Subunit: 423 residues, 4 copies
């Protein structure tokens, strides 16, 4: 065996360029960390490899648990931590595997997709698959991006509500907007300020900056632009106080009517027509029953529950699964699952099922954040939308938004059919 060497030593070895770590033992590193000679947060750099750093962190953590063996089945080895450090997570102690299933082919805008879904919910993928099959037999779905821009809603404060009114008026003129647009756009090549939306509350002024952001989701870029624009605004109104760069007016990761009404990120609509025969044989129901259930659940039931933007069956399921599979920020599902599902009779006999899904606030990107990790990049690649689209910036993010809407629609179709048919 062996025993730890004193603390005063073991820094000699740590320092030595040749005789570095890989000569110390785990217990020795533990001792050095417990003595404050190393900061634990740095263990992945000050250590021969990154995996060993997370190992050390795990051992330290285990010592403080009531059940020391808790981490046994949390996997941490043979994972590329270099892409996570300083980018994606801190105090890393391993990774959480989420099973990934595949729904498809989804026939959307004359193409076919195979949609990865990371879920632990049994039967979700199978239900989505049945919906995909129904749509495919129906002659495919169609989608359109209606609007596109990520937003940031800072709140600033003036000495008096009259001053706030003055600032609002100045922002509404062409000259003031031009100045703010120039300041905002100077911060990046994709920063192209669109029309501003202001709201006063007493001496608080809430300003909603909106802009396209290439293929990135846009939060960092929009925030940077917002900060620069607010500095410029401060130049004209030195009494202005920037209270918060986010005033919950964006609105980011909270339910808000503003996202529903004005949009946030990408606004999409998708539609399909399902023949009567296909509704009978694949969905095991009828068009009339589907419409009845749609009206009395997604419209009237949501209305009685007091829903804003929740006029759908389970869009959040599909959205969350895809988001986790493709490296999106999963909290954003809060806003991104806003959807209204409509079903009607169609065809020369009113026997076919027309269905449409409308999702005004799909917050999504294919560059930056979680999309920088290879496993998530794989799921993006199987869709054909990985990374930046050099020719037509933002095209990959738009395509991913369309696929999200189409998959949500297939899921709606399937779950609605199941509810209408009974058990």
């Amino acid at each position: 065996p062996r025993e730890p060497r004193p603390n005063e030593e073991c820094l000699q070895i740590l320092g030595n360029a040749e005789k570095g770590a890989k000569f110390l033992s785990d217990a020795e590193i533990i001792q050095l960390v417990n003595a404050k000679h190393i900061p634990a947060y740095k263990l992945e750099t000050l250590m021969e490899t990154h995996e060993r750093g997370v190992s050390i962190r795990r051992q330290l953590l285990s010592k403080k648990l009531s059940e020391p063996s808790s981490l046994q089945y949390l996997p941490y080895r043979d994972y590329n931590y270099s892409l996570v450090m300083g980018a994606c997570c801190e105090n890393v102690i391993g990774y959480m595997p989420i099973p990934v299933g595949v729904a498809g082919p989804l026939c959307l805008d004359e193409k076919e997709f195979q949609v990865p879904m990371a879920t632990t919910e049994g039967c979700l993928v199978a239900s989505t698959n049945r919906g995909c099959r129904a749509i495919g037999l129906g002659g495919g779905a169609s989608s359109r991006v209606l609007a596109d821009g990520m937003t940031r809603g800072p709140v600033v404060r003036l000495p008096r509500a009259c001053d706030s009114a003055e600032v609002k008026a100045w922002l509404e003129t062409s000259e003031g907007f031009a100045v703010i647009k120039e300041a905002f756009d100077s911060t990046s090549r994709f920063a192209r300020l669109q029309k501003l939306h202001t709201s006063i509350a007493g001496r608080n002024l809430y300003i909603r900056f909106q802009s396209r952001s290439g293929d990135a989701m846009g939060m960092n870029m929009i925030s940077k632009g917002t900060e620069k624009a607010l500095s410029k605004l401060h130049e004209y109104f030195p009494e202005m106080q920037i209270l918060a760069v986010s005033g919950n007016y964006c609105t980011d990761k909270k339910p808000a009517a503003i996202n529903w009404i004005e949009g946030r990120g990408k606004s999409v609509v998708c539609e399909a027509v399902i023949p009567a025969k296909v509704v009978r044989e694949v969905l095991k129901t009828t068009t009339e029953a589907m419409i009845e259930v749609n009206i009395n659940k997604n419209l009237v039931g949501s209305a009685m529950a007091g829903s804003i933007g929740g006029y759908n069956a389970h869009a959040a399921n599909i959205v969350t699964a895809i988001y986790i599979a493709c490296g999106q920020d999963a909290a954003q599902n809060v806003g991104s699952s806003n959807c209204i599902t409509l079903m009607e009779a169609s065809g020369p006999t009113n026997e076919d099922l027309y269905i449409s899904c409308t999702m005004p606030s799909i917050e999504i990107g294919t560059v930056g954040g979680g999309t920088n990790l290879l496993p998530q990049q794989a799921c993006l690649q199987m869709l054909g939308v990985q990374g930046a689209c050099k020719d037509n910036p933002g095209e990959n993010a738009r395509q991913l938004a369309r696929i999200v809407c189409g998959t949500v629609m297939a899921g709606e179709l399937s779950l609605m059919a199941a509810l209408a048919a009974g058990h």
Copy 2:
């Protein structure tokens, strides 16, 4: 090398008890699947091991992709698929690793927790950690479960709105409620029907069944009980038509005022007091600035955005990270992140920061679904709440809800301090 054998053969080998798979090659299985002799969804059972089944599925999928090499960095090997089959996912082609960091210790109700957070969002864990530290220096946090029961909101339809009124009246009497409660409770040992909430819309009657469910999240159990109760109800009103077992009146996985006002799952409140000195040194701000930002962002900004239940900074971040780490259904964050954050001055000098978070609709469990997988069980175990609590059923789920609320509060504290301090 070798070449595939005919299709008529290769079923002989597949059938043979001794000379089964493990004698066929990958190309041979591919051929059999393409000929419809095997259903692909069954590949994980009709194959020597489960891993090989997912391998076959992956190869089939790769053939249909525009970039055949897309799956290269999607990991699938050395993962226990036995627990996922028939429970958690279908058409499995691997798993998605989510980095797991640790925030803590969180000092909550006189105990210390180490909270796992699965995220790809940089700096989230560090910010939560700073909040945890502030709370810890402040003398710890306190929490209470206020209400507990999962809900299912079926919609039924009567011939006339007068009939719907009759059914509603009958449900409101002690005898009718007793009959329905007996029918509902007969379906499981944890099914204990609480008071019903009805809403009429014309001839549609929406009924919200609520009940505790042990340590499970409860959806399956509540749905089963609801179905039995609806059959019983049909016995008294044979003209009733059960339109959908879910009428969006639960409300499950959609923003709804009903969850905010009546609660869903567990309702929790947490609070702490942060000394002025700690607010200065750890949070790098002052109590007055924190209160100003809290009022003008979480209350007024959310009000101007038209938020229902979104009166907080970023509760969805913390909720989503914990949910993914601990095997919860992540779509449920849609409802579970509803929170209101309040900050006030406190102490003999009004210099200390009182903070409270209130979350009325935390949907959460520690048994069933994603909590059946070992990696997620590890994260549950490091909290001390894994599985069913035999002595006091539901205690582990309640504890997990308390920890969720406390972590959300630490996150609020940190992010609010950052916004108040500026860059």
Copy 3:
């Protein structure tokens, strides 16, 4: 002519029992008021008649206007001010005439009503009349009161959120509720506390007391009961601070999801079936067009606008007109107009139009407040619901609520037909 006498005199005459007012002139009273010898608010008592007091007030006001002749066409004479003083208005300077039309007969629950509507909106009464005619030809409407109780939502505050939780738990037990119910019910013969609804936010506890109130609208009585109950509650928790007797949790005269979901005042549903032929000849449209418009305006359009409880065409018009005619508090229309209108196909051929209106928060009374004035009492009397119903307390208020719902439904029918038919 004549000239004012000194100020020191003119109080002699004012004081004298025999030689009182009616001997002073208008200018003399004006002088006394301007000298502070009389308070203007008392002019209607310290004056030979009430009309003369309002006359004096009018002259005083006229002197301070930029156009002294402004009041010329504001009528004030031959009106009974005795019933308004100390009850209904202060600083009275006349009355505002609102034209009153009559819609009907409305065939409701096998009876016929003639509904007075006080409006200045052209064509409202005629449109309501056409709707009434359609309903009448359709075999009349049917209605039910589903729930009944006015509410008051005080807010109280505890030292800590844990204390608030304790109070909430205590209110939820049978013993605590019994004590509170006794205290509340002791304050009047109609005060019968129903189940309480609580909501915590940090250390704020919001309590919604609900109760029937006879035939009165109930606000005064409910408030009195609430105050008594809060005193009783304070006895058990001496640290409780009653922050406000109304915490906007009632919710009174503001849009709130709580009124929509839980009800406030009376909850009513009304329905009718309109034969296809009648829809063609009276409404000048078809059933299919009516349903299409109903779905895509009252459901989907309201959903896209982010409406809570506004799933109807113009219920506020009818509600406001009736309320003003019948002496109701017209501000209450804010909550009382919440309505959802549903239309469906019906009959053996799906050719007839089924319509239903559901209004969960009709706040209404037939005693107290504006219902104490004779002109408003006349409008109540032509409906047959004036004053208290001695046999069956609250029956007149319930009947008035039913009539309101039925008239709203007729208005919906007519306006929807007009919109569907085009110009």
Copy 4:
């Protein structure tokens, strides 16, 4: 006495130019109406005077009532019906007197107003008066109009959601908007189309036209412009179906988040600062208590109730009273009472009370509708805003909106002080 003459006769007299009505008796007219020889709706024209026509209508109505004497105290005589016929009401049977009190002087934007309030709610005027006094002692209030335009939200339908997207895109271009603006503006001199707001839901397109309308409230003018613009739009997309001229997307007379977020009619902010001493002596409270109550009632209590736009104490009371006094459409209070009230500490010592009211959707006019009647014109005249302002069109409506906001603020101040002080 006398007896009715046959029916065949009595039309001779009715017809005769010289020997017309005024020779027939009331019973004779009754007989002619009952025989269908006269339509009752025309009684006010085919009769010597208008008053006599309403008299005849009253007698007819009385015959059909269960209590024939119901109309006795409903006044109808000595009222100018000429201005109501064909403009304001139909089937008129009299008028409803509403007592009118006066609150003021209100010191607003360096001027003084005397605000008429038509109410039957006891103590409302006195409370508003106390608020006015506090504001006056505080150095007056200040207000600003932030935005101004009435809206109409038609809904149109396309064959497919892709077609709806095409129409939306075309409306968003400068050329399409120019064409629509020209068509819309051609219909009146005040019709000046501002930027359009569209929302898709499947194949439904909801278009929100907004425009200033002079001093009129604007509904009729905006509707006319909308119809013309929709015809023009139909020229480019012949497959478009105009489903309804109002799709509840305006949104008119329903609670909707869209009015809160985008505004409707006039958006106003008012503010004042109340010295500490004045808060003590007039309001009988302290600044700290006022702020506490404001936060925990108007913000947190409204949030817990799930309010959109109802973050105030009782703005609907003031709004309704003024609207009824000044001839406004009182149903519009539903949208016009949306308000947020904010209170803060202010001054060199944080002892003074800053208060602000923000009302984004004040729907109001001073021409047309109820403002055409002399009694309502009197109330408009005492404010100085009656009729059209020839120099600066719309200035009178803007001034009236400012006064409404200021009066609401005084009412908030008073009621909040009363709640904070207790009984």
